[PDB]
Amino acid sequence: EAVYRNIQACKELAQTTRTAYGPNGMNKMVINHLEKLFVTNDAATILRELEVQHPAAKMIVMASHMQEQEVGDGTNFVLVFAGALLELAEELLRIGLSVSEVIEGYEIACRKAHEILPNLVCCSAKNLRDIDEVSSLLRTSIMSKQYGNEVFLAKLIAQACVSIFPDSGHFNVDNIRVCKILGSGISSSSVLHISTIVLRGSTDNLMDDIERAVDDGVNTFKVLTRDKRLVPGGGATEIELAKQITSYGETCPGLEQYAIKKFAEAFEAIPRALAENSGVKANEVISKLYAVHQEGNKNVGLDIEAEVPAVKDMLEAGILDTYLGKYWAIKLATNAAVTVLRVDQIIMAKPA
Amino acid sequence: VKTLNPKAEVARAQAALAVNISAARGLQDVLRTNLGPKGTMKMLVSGAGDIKLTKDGNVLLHEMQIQHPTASLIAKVATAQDDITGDGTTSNVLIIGELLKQADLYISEGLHPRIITEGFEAAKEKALQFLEEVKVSREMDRETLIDVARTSLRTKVHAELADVLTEAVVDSILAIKKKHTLTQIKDAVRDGLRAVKNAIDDGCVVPGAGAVEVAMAEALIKHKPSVKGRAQLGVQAFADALLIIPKVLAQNSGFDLQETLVKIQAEHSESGQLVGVDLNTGEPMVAAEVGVWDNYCVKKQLLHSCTVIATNILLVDEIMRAG
Amino acid sequence: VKTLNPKAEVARAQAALAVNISAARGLQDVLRTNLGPKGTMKMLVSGAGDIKLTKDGNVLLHEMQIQHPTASLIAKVATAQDDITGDGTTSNVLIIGELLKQADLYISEGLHPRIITEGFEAAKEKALQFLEEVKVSREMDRETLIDVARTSLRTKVHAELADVLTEAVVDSILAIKKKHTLTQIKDAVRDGLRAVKNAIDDGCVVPGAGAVEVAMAEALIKHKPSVKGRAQLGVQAFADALLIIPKVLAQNSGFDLQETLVKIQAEHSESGQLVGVDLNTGEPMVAAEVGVWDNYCVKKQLLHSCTVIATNILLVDEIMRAG
Amino acid sequence: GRKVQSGNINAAKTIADIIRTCLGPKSMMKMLLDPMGGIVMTNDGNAILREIQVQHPAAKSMIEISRTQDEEVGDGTTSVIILAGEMLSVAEHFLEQQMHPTVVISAYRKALDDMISTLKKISIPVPQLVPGGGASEMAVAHALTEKSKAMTGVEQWPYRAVAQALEVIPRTLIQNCGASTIRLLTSLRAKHTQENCETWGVNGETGTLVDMKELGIWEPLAVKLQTYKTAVETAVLLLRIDDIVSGHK
Amino acid sequence: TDSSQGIPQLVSNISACQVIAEAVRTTLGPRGMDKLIVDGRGKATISNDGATILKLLDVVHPAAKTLVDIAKSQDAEVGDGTTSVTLLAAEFLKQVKPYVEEGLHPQIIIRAFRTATQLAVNKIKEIAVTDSVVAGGGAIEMELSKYLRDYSRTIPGKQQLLIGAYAKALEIIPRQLCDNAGFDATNILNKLRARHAQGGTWYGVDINNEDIADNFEAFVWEPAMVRINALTAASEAACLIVSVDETIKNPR
Numbered sequence A: 001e002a003v004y005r006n007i008q009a010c011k012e013l014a015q016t017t018r019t020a021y022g023p024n025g026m027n028k029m030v031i032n033h034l035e036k037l038f039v040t041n042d043a044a045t046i047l048r049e050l051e052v053q054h055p056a057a058k059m060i061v062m063a064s065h066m067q068e069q070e071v072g073d074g075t076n077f078v079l080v081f082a083g084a085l086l087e088l089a090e091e092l093l094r095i096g097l098s099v100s101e102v103i104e105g106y107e108i109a110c111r112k113a114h115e116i117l118p119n120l121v122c123c124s125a126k127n128l129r130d131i132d133e134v135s136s137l138l139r140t141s142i143m144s145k146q147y148g149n150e151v152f153l154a155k156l157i158a159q160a161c162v163s164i165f166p167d168s169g170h171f172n173v174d175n176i177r178v179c180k181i182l183g184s185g186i187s188s189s190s191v192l193h194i195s196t197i198v199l200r201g202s203t204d205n206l207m208d209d210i211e212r213a214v215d216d217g218v219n220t221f222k223v224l225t226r227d228k229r230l231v232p233g234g235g236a237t238e239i240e241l242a243k244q245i246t247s248y249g250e251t252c253p254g255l256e257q258y259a260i261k262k263f264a265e266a267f268e269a270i271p272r273a274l275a276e277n278s279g280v281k282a283n284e285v286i287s288k289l290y291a292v293h294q295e296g297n298k299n300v301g302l303d304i305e306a307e308v309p310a311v312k313d314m315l316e317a318g319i320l321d322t323y324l325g326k327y328w329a330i331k332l333a334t335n336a337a338v339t340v341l342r343v344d345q346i347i348m349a350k351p352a
Numbered sequence B, C: 001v002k003t004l005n006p007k008a009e010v011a012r013a014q015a016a017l018a019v020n021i022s023a024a025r026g027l028q029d030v031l032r033t034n035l036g037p038k039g040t041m042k043m044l045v046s047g048a049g050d051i052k053l054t055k056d057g058n059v060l061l062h063e064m065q066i067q068h069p070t071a072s073l074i075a076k077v078a079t080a081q082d083d084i085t086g087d088g089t090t091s092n093v094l095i096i097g098e099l100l101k102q103a104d105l106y107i108s109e110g111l112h113p114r115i116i117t118e119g120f121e122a123a124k125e126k127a128l129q130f131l132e133e134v135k136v137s138r139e140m141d142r143e144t145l146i147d148v149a150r151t152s153l154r155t156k157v158h159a160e161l162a163d164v165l166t167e168a169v170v171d172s173i174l175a176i177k178k179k180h181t182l183t184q185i186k187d188a189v190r191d192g193l194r195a196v197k198n199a200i201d202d203g204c205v206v207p208g209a210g211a212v213e214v215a216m217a218e219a220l221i222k223h224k225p226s227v228k229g230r231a232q233l234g235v236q237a238f239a240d241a242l243l244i245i246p247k248v249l250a251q252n253s254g255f256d257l258q259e260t261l262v263k264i265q266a267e268h269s270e271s272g273q274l275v276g277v278d279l280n281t282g283e284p285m286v287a288a289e290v291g292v293w294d295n296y297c298v299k300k301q302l303l304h305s306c307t308v309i310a311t312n313i314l315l316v317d318e319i320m321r322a323g
Numbered sequence D: 001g002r003k004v005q006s007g008n009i010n011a012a013k014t015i016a017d018i019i020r021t022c023l024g025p026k027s028m029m030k031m032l033l034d035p036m037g038g039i040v041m042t043n044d045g046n047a048i049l050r051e052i053q054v055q056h057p058a059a060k061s062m063i064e065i066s067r068t069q070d071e072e073v074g075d076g077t078t079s080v081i082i083l084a085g086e087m088l089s090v091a092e093h094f095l096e097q098q099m100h101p102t103v104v105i106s107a108y109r110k111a112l113d114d115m116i117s118t119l120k121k122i123s124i125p126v127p128q129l130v131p132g133g134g135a136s137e138m139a140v141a142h143a144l145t146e147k148s149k150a151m152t153g154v155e156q157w158p159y160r161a162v163a164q165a166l167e168v169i170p171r172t173l174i175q176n177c178g179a180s181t182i183r184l185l186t187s188l189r190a191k192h193t194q195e196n197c198e199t200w201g202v203n204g205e206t207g208t209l210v211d212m213k214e215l216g217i218w219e220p221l222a223v224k225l226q227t228y229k230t231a232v233e234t235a236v237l238l239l240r241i242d243d244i245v246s247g248h249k
Numbered sequence E: 001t002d003s004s005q006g007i008p009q010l011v012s013n014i015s016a017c018q019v020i021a022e023a024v025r026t027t028l029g030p031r032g033m034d035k036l037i038v039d040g041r042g043k044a045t046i047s048n049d050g051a052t053i054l055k056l057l058d059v060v061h062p063a064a065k066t067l068v069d070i071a072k073s074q075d076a077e078v079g080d081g082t083t084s085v086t087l088l089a090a091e092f093l094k095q096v097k098p099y100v101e102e103g104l105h106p107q108i109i110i111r112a113f114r115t116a117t118q119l120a121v122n123k124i125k126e127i128a129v130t131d132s133v134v135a136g137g138g139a140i141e142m143e144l145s146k147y148l149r150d151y152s153r154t155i156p157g158k159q160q161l162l163i164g165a166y167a168k169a170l171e172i173i174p175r176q177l178c179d180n181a182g183f184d185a186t187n188i189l190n191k192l193r194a195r196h197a198q199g200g201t202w203y204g205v206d207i208n209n210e211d212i213a214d215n216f217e218a219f220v221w222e223p224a225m226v227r228i229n230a231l232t233a234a235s236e237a238a239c240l241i242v243s244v245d246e247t248i249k250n251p252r
């Protein structure tokens, strides 16, 4: 009765963010501690002004911050996937297995998922200096954040990152400064010279969003410098991971079976939140994705463009993701979920 | 007519035994989940909000808001009793929580508390005897200390950290002889250091996994007839009480805490070798062979501490409002 | 929107075990005082006001205002179970009140009721065995029947009337074979007649005074290891339960019901002869020599009746409001 | 659905839960408390059902269906209120995801046609007999779970839900023996994924797994067919009831 | 009010925008009811202009505040059309509440106020006449409505009854133009719709007399660019308030 209040708070932490996942993510009005309305789509800034105080939920936010400083993206994955992990654990503890029996099941499934991933990579970044290969490939990071002028920001950030770049790596995400000249005209933004993006918004509230999108953009260039392996985005890799983990769980006997199958059904909660944020029915598209991934397409994902539940290849469409950005996402999400699964009977402390 | 009121009247004869026993049982049911590997951490949020995963007895009893005054006592007396032995709490609080429950039956049946405690004393003597005849004393080679440190590090951190710190603690003591998760790692390393130190000091690594609790309870029951009259009801409440450690060990690993204990008591009676609780399959296992070791400085004091505290909390007639 | 209410929801899984066990324990604590000589009558005032000293189980359970429905059951099933044996109530209700209490411990510990009752069955079989090996079968001379009638008449009336009716009942059966205190004398004579008749019918006068309860509980405990797994917890709750009869026998005579029982269990283990409870000095006594006898038709059915009722009242999940 | 196919599942859940444990050789008595004095203990599902005034039309229909089955086939009358409370309990997890009752009824009625294909297949002659215990249910469940790996549709989750709902019969045959329903049902699943182990069931008196070709429990394949038909029909007769309105005649 | 997350929050924001528009509606038009707003100094300000009412009004609700900021932004750069903008915005929000009470979802309502608005500004830039001018006093919202519904009839999918509700939500500007003069709107609008079905792409409400009048000939003119900017700003305000899912009020 005390491990269910933790899960019932990590759920409510994952529901105020789930609705801001895909490019079609909602856009909520976060009143600032200073009372300044900046309606923002970013779901890492939401946590800054939400200040979740329930300690069980605070650990998922700490894992989200770890993902925000280890890599630059996947902040929602870390708290929309850990939320599914715990929602399904509560759906599994009531069967009665124990906290102990589902934690190690999740750990086995996470070890499995980190060995499936390097077999899901389907692209790379052959030349990290070719400007179209740095724009068309860095698009998805901004597209997920700022749908619309996804390719203009893509190119304008590709220019900045490729310019200040040695022959060995050493990309510095703090090198690219971002000016915020309160002009008018998004297109008027450019890259001066260490670089700098002038980022001429219109009202100093529709370029702060663009400033966060630039953050998420260049953060994808940094990780792309460390690991070139790229995995299909838009639920493709998630559905494939879920399929293979379900298979592994079906082969393996014992009580870990249930936790492994729940870890797969927790991976299915990424394309479910991707579709539920677009109007299409979630079950329709999860079935249409599992049925094309069984044939062996391995690269098909959600089609955000259409109105009805639709499937589309993500390699030929160019909506990819980054390998490290999902490796660390799954790792930190599992570690966060198993942590607040251990914690029972949150006691108050003694006044020091 | 000034000052004619005889105030200060609380807790008469049982009203205090009931209160103290309920407080001890509550403190047991709070720490019952954190015993052994596959246990369960606790949060301990402060006023500022500094969470602290704290699966152990010392840091818990020393830092948690214990409302009941009797439980506050049992914690102030149990914390100050595990710095001469290193770490044996979370077993003290439980065993006390059964010396005080297995006695509530006979006390409610109409027995006098100072009759059980005589049985507690005789049972403690026989338990110390059986523990001095069961100590396996072997050389403190790096191999054994690996086990004596791994079994005490898996107790505080999972097998990811408790499989890289064993080497660091058995090679930081073999070179001296002649964030909310850094506090956790620091305390686990200080407790593995204390465990390997206590193993080095005496040289006895008496088996664990509840094997000695089972073998110490059954020798008592085989010794009960030869003690005395109503004293026998103190060695049959100190026998079923050094029997929760296997029970709670099985309970924390998702097993029925009556089938595993029965299998252990049967397999111990067949082969005569002291057998413990396998935390993965629930079947009995030989803790000496598998490589789980307790300390003859921790279970030698787990008897004195538990018996002293339980006898003292059984020997109370009134709880009165002092100044 | 007519008729959308799922009514009738009471007593879920334990909510009914707790209720039934508390009802059985209350019915035990009501009849606990009337067991054995030196017992205690009850009043049973009717509506008109006809008082009736009624120290026995049949007339009590059959005529008293039993409020709790479960206790009303246990009495409707216990009264209809002592006309095939003559008189063995007041021991049924007590033993049931311990098969249901000594099981509440293990059940609250997390056991399933249908695991204890298997142990109840095995223990009943071993108890019937030990009772068929302990029956002392002797001639039904007027001497022995004097004892078998005096021990059953002192149970219902004091030693003033129970020393002039023994002759009248052993000479009213040796001639047929081949006011609020007249009802009392009539019932005591009908119960001495039934007792001497049951002694004549089979020829076994198996000792009483709780001696067979003690000797039947200790043989069980010596047989517990050889039964099964968690079934053992049914022969260790059917052993400490065929142990209240000596306990309550001692309690009704103003003795501590743990010292006398310990002395009896020790003296029985030394000399191996089944020993009972002396109701005058509290010291153990040999019921066979002193001249107190039970019937092998009353204690052969005290096991079946108690076990059946207790197993049935342990095997309840819901108490639902019927029509 | 809405609050009418979820107020008909709670009636079915209530009726099933009342008798769920009155099943097996290790039955567990229940107490029927009359207005005046009350207690009458009986481990017979039918009497318990014929003596509790439910007053709810859904529950009244489950009781009615159960009585008819009892007065038609006799045996398999407390395995009908179950598998209809259980198959409804799993239906609610899809009526909460905005899935029309027509879709689950098109899945239940589709699982049935495959439910009665392995009972015809795992049967033994001398009509025919089907392995008792939980073997017949676990065999059907595994068969449906293997047939549901080629569904590629939205009526694929309700298909597996029915399969995993034919486990409340072993789940109770294990719960009444005191054993752990989880650690044992997983072993049953493991046993049933093999080739010939289609008769492995639960020893209803010991709480252990025994091949029913060696324990000797067998149920006729006319009380295991009418049971499943009646269950999956009371599960689609209480799922297609959109409104409970007044009626004058 | 619930105003928790999703449909409840959207309905709350819609009601707040309805309130903030209802506080300015009667001011729309050449001759419109004044408003007597008093500051904290006891000054009586009578002004029949929506700009000077929103700059003197306490906006303590977030959605209302965003709508008022977009209205002030329109008033700052363009001038004309700071109450028609908020009127169109609140009407767009009012006419999708019956569709957002179901699970239609805002993400789809947003891909109906952007296709329809782009099409309407295309129609304006195609039908405008010469600097380019279009007949005001209605006569556009009564034509853009006829065009948008006649086009939405040819849309297979969910955007049919959303563009068809976008179109129906334009009839308010030619409605309160005559509801402010007291002209029995449900008759002048019926005449305008009937006259826009046949022909008359410049027929709008006349204010000198209770009848429809060709507004291009009557020289009641509106700059095409101003109408396009007002339409785009109103649609963007709508989309903003429709694209809001929760209100994260920082605890401190």
Ligand SMILES: Nc1ncnc2c1ncn2[C@@H]1O[C@H](COP(=O)(O)OP(=O)(O)O)[C@@H](O)[C@H]1O
Pocket (backbone or CB within 6 Å): A020, A021, A022, A023, A073, A074, A075, A076, A077, A140, A141, A143, A144, A145, A233, A234, A235, A274, A302, A303, A304, A319, A321
């Ligand atoms: N155009 C697209 N179509 C479909 N799915 C997309 C598209 N762009 C991104 N995605 C997916 O949705 C996610 C949205 O990213 P977002 O949740 O904002 O970042 P993160 O979760 O990594 O912090 C991407 O990581 C990717 O998996």
Ligand SMILES: Nc1ncnc2c1ncn2[C@@H]1O[C@H](COP(=O)(O)OP(=O)(O)O)[C@@H](O)[C@H]1O
Pocket (backbone or CB within 6 Å): B034, B035, B036, B037, B039, B087, B088, B089, B090, B091, B151, B152, B154, B155, B207, B208, B209, B210, B245, B249, B277, B278, B279, B292, B293, B294
């Ligand atoms: N790997 C293991 N397997 C089985 N039992 C163990 C293992 N590690 C420790 N134990 C047992 O758990 C018991 C309780 O330890 P715990 O309460 O967690 O810490 P402490 O030893 O400080 O009380 C010890 O008596 C020990 O025998």
Ligand SMILES: Nc1ncnc2c1ncn2[C@@H]1O[C@H](COP(=O)(O)OP(=O)(O)O)[C@@H](O)[C@H]1O
Pocket (backbone or CB within 6 Å): C034, C035, C036, C037, C039, C087, C088, C089, C090, C091, C151, C152, C154, C155, C207, C208, C209, C210, C245, C249, C277, C278, C279, C292, C293, C294
């Ligand atoms: N004189 C006696 N001394 C000791 N015990 C006795 C004596 N008379 C009877 N008892 C014991 O008292 C027990 C209970 O008898 P009681 O409950 O009074 O009536 P019933 O025999 O009908 O249950 C019997 O088992 C018998 O052994």
Ligand SMILES: Nc1ncnc2c1ncn2[C@@H]1O[C@H](COP(=O)(O)OP(=O)(O)O)[C@@H](O)[C@H]1O
Pocket (backbone or CB within 6 Å): D022, D023, D024, D025, D074, D075, D076, D077, D078, D079, D080, D132, D133, D134, D169, D173, D202, D203, D204, D205, D217, D219
């Ligand atoms: N000895 C047994 N061991 C295991 N299962 C059994 C045994 N006897 C019967 N069963 C099973 O118990 C289930 C419940 O049957 P029962 O409780 O008699 O009611 P019904 O079959 O009428 O629903 C049946 O599936 C039957 O095959």
Ligand SMILES: Nc1ncnc2c1ncn2[C@@H]1O[C@H](COP(=O)(O)OP(=O)(O)O)[C@@H](O)[C@H]1O
Pocket (backbone or CB within 6 Å): E027, E028, E029, E030, E050, E079, E080, E081, E082, E083, E084, E136, E137, E138, E173, E177, E205, E206, E207, E220, E222
């Ligand atoms: N003389 C007029 N006859 C008919 N309609 C008019 C006339 N003058 C203005 N309008 C209409 O009134 C509407 C509101 O304009 P108004 O409130 O005066 O300024 P704003 O356009 O800034 O709100 C405009 O859409 C315009 O078409």
Ligand SMILES: [Mg+2]
Pocket (backbone or CB within 6 Å): A073, A074, A075, A141, A144, A145, A216
């Ligand atoms: Mg992102």
Ligand SMILES: [Mg+2]
Pocket (backbone or CB within 6 Å): B087, B088, B152, B155
């Ligand atoms: Mg320790």
Ligand SMILES: [Mg+2]
Pocket (backbone or CB within 6 Å): C087, C088, C152, C155
């Ligand atoms: Mg008698």
Ligand SMILES: [Mg+2]
Pocket (backbone or CB within 6 Å): D075, D076, D077
């Ligand atoms: Mg049957």
Ligand SMILES: [Mg+2]
Pocket (backbone or CB within 6 Å): E079, E080, E081, E082
């Ligand atoms: Mg104007």
